Design an enzyme around this catalytic site. Structure first.
Site, PDB file in Angstrom:
ATOM      1  N   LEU A   1       0.711  -1.264   0.052  1.00 42.02           N
ATOM      2  CA  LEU A   1      -0.061   0.024   0.152  1.00 42.02           C
ATOM      3  C   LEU A   1       0.855   1.267  -0.077  1.00 42.02           C
ATOM      4  O   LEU A   1       0.897   1.973  -1.015  1.00 42.02           O
ATOM      5  CB  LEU A   1      -1.062  -0.040   1.308  1.00 42.02           C
ATOM      6  CG  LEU A   1      -2.231  -0.832   1.293  1.00 42.02           C
ATOM      7  CD1 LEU A   1      -2.690  -0.848   2.724  1.00 42.02           C
ATOM      8  CD2 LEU A   1      -3.263  -0.323   0.122  1.00 42.02           C
ATOM      9  N   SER A   2       1.605   1.156   0.994  1.00 43.47           N
ATOM     10  CA  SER A   2       2.710   2.675   1.047  1.00 43.47           C
ATOM     11  C   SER A   2       3.980   2.244   1.933  1.00 43.47           C
ATOM     12  O   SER A   2       3.914   1.567   2.760  1.00 43.47           O
ATOM     13  CB  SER A   2       1.777   3.757   1.799  1.00 43.47           C
ATOM     14  OG  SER A   2       1.961   3.664   2.876  1.00 43.47           O
ATOM     15  N   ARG A   3       5.152   2.697   1.414  1.00 45.21           N
ATOM     16  CA  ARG A   3       6.265   2.649   2.195  1.00 45.21           C
ATOM     17  C   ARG A   3       6.163   3.932   3.141  1.00 45.21           C
ATOM     18  O   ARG A   3       5.645   5.070   2.760  1.00 45.21           O
ATOM     19  CB  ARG A   3       7.528   2.696   1.373  1.00 45.21           C
ATOM     20  CG  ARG A   3       9.018   2.424   2.099  1.00 45.21           C
ATOM     21  CD  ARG A   3       9.937   2.180   1.057  1.00 45.21           C
ATOM     22  N   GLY A   4       7.151   4.193   4.119  1.00 44.21           N
ATOM     23  CA  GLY A   4       7.446   5.280   4.784  1.00 44.21           C
ATOM     24  C   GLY A   4       8.402   5.273   5.675  1.00 44.21           C
ATOM     25  O   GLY A   4       9.782   4.552   5.279  1.00 44.21           O
ATOM     26  N   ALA A   5       8.593   6.299   6.507  1.00 40.82           N
ATOM     27  CA  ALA A   5       9.879   6.391   7.482  1.00 40.82           C
ATOM     28  C   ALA A   5       9.521   5.331   8.634  1.00 40.82           C
ATOM     29  O   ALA A   5      10.591   4.561   9.072  1.00 40.82           O
ATOM     30  CB  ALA A   5       9.811   7.778   8.092  1.00 40.82           C
TER      31      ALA A   5
ATOM     32  N   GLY B   1       7.568   2.500   8.505  1.00 34.81           N
ATOM     33  CA  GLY B   1       7.869   1.198   7.895  1.00 34.81           C
ATOM     34  C   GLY B   1       6.868   1.181   6.701  1.00 34.81           C
ATOM     35  O   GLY B   1       6.485   2.056   6.118  1.00 34.81           O
TER      36      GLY B   1
ATOM     37  N   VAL C   1       3.726  -0.319   4.731  1.00 36.50           N
ATOM     38  CA  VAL C   1       2.232  -1.013   5.127  1.00 36.50           C
ATOM     39  C   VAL C   1       1.842  -1.633   3.786  1.00 36.50           C
ATOM     40  O   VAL C   1       1.682  -1.003   2.851  1.00 36.50           O
ATOM     41  CB  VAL C   1       1.425   0.250   5.547  1.00 36.50           C
ATOM     42  CG1 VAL C   1      -0.006  -0.102   5.502  1.00 36.50           C
ATOM     43  CG2 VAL C   1       1.789   0.845   6.936  1.00 36.50           C
TER      44      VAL C   1
ATOM     45  N   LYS D   1       1.615  -3.746   8.726  1.00 33.46           N
ATOM     46  CA  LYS D   1       2.630  -2.701   8.997  1.00 33.46           C
ATOM     47  C   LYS D   1       3.924  -3.718   9.150  1.00 33.46           C
ATOM     48  O   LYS D   1       4.152  -4.365  10.260  1.00 33.46           O
ATOM     49  CB  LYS D   1       2.707  -1.465   9.993  1.00 33.46           C
ATOM     50  CG  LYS D   1       3.691  -0.676   9.828  1.00 33.46           C
ATOM     51  CD  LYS D   1       3.344   0.628  10.794  1.00 33.46           C
ATOM     52  CE  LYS D   1       4.695   1.298  11.089  1.00 33.46           C
ATOM     53  NZ  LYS D   1       4.557   2.484  12.101  1.00 33.46           N
TER      54      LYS D   1
ATOM     55  N   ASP E   1       3.574  12.602  17.351  1.00 35.11           N
ATOM     56  CA  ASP E   1       3.731  12.422  15.833  1.00 35.11           C
ATOM     57  C   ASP E   1       2.229  12.581  15.407  1.00 35.11           C
ATOM     58  O   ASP E   1       2.079  12.012  14.326  1.00 35.11           O
ATOM     59  CB  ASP E   1       4.405  11.345  15.563  1.00 35.11           C
ATOM     60  CG  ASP E   1       4.829  11.462  14.067  1.00 35.11           C
ATOM     61  OD1 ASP E   1       5.064  12.367  13.633  1.00 35.11           O
ATOM     62  OD2 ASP E   1       4.970  10.039  13.544  1.00 35.11           O
TER      63      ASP E   1
END
Ligand SMILES: NC(=O)c1c(-c2ccc3scnc3c2)nn2c1N[C@H]1C[C@H](C[C@@H]1O)C2
Length: 279
Positions: free
Chosen positions: A20-24, A26, A28, A43, A139
């Site tokens: 679905l999505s990468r991020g800082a 981790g 998902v 995640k 956050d």
């Protein structure tokens, strides 16, 4: 002392594991549980380190302990040699960020829904502050406010919580129980404006310099139009929420006491009409 253990879920039960999505924080992914017959989110980490494993186990412990109506429900943990991930309910309606800023996709977000979103974020953070010991999110940003199939708020991303962008960080944290309420105020400004904070500023440090000198996202007829419901109260709440002096920012209990009378002016069906109008 009534306790419950977070279930362990075998990797092989997580079918159609699609990114679905990468991020800082981790990566998902979406999956579907073979036994439970429901879509889920996982995640996980980018495909096996030691204190990486510690961080995920910590976040999963927290989600499990922090369970609440406005907090992302953890369903279990995948804990195996090859794979480690937190399994939660899938949030099909994205994040609040996408709702506010994808204006071609969402040209009308009716007022009642926006207020409900603000109410529910507040109720979610407030719950965390009322745990023993208080959990501080630290956050909060519109990216971390996820939206369920009914556009109700689930708060997510507990990587920086204590028992990317700086737009939501109070000035004193550049080098405290009053952090989240500052982030909340900026989110409240963002939700009511549908504008990016400090849109006309190139550099983050220019924002930080301005913020530490007392400046805040602009409040005029252009940012926050005169037809906003309860414009004056909401502006006070925003301005107190992000006050330079942390002692002058409100607790979320106070915040909720200010919101309740506003939210009560919205009939329950108008939230449904607000949601149905959306893509
Ligand atoms: N639950 C979800 O569906 C998630 C999560 C998610 C999942 C598990 C955990 S454990 C701690 N925080 C999280 C957050 N992140 N996102 C989601 N949904 C949409 C918006 C983007 C990607 C999707 O399009 C971000």
């Amino acid at each position: 002392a009534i306790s419950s253990a977070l279930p362990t879920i075998p990797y092989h039960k997580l079918a159609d594991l699609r990114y679905l999505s990468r991020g800082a924080s981790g990566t998902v992914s979406s999956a579907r549980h073979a036994d439970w017959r429901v879509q889920v989110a996982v995640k996980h980490l980018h495909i096996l380190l030691d204190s990486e494993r510690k961080d995920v186990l910590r976040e999963a412990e927290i989600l499990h302990k922090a369970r609440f109506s406005y907090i992302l429900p953890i369903l279990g943990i995948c804990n195996e040699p090859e794979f480690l991930g937190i399994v939660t309910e899938y949030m099909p309606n994205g994040s609040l960020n996408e709702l506010l800023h994808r204006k071609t996709e969402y040209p009308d977000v009716a007022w009642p829904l926006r207020f409900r979103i603000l109410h529910e974020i507040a109720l979610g953070v407030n719950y965390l502050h009322n745990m023993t010991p208080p959990l501080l999110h630290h956050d909060l940003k519109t990216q971390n406010i996820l939206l369920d199939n009914e556009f109700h708020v689930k708060i997510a991303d507990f990587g920086l919580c204590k028992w990317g962008t700086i737009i939501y960080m109070p000035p004193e944290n550049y080098e405290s129980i009053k952090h989240d309420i500052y982030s909340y105020a900026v989110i409240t400004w963002e939700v009511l404006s549908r504008k990016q904070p400090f849109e006309d500023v190139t550099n983050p440090l220019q924002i930080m310099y301005s913020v530490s000198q007392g400046h805040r996202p602009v409040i005029n007829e252009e940012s926050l139009p005169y037809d906003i419901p309860h414009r004056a109260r909401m502006i006070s709440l925003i301005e107190s929420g992000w006050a330079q002096n942390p002692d002058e920012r409100p607790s979320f209990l106070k915040c909720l006491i200010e919101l309740e009378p506003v939210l009560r002016t919205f009939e329950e069906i108008t939230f449904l009409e607000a949601v149905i109008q959306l893509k």
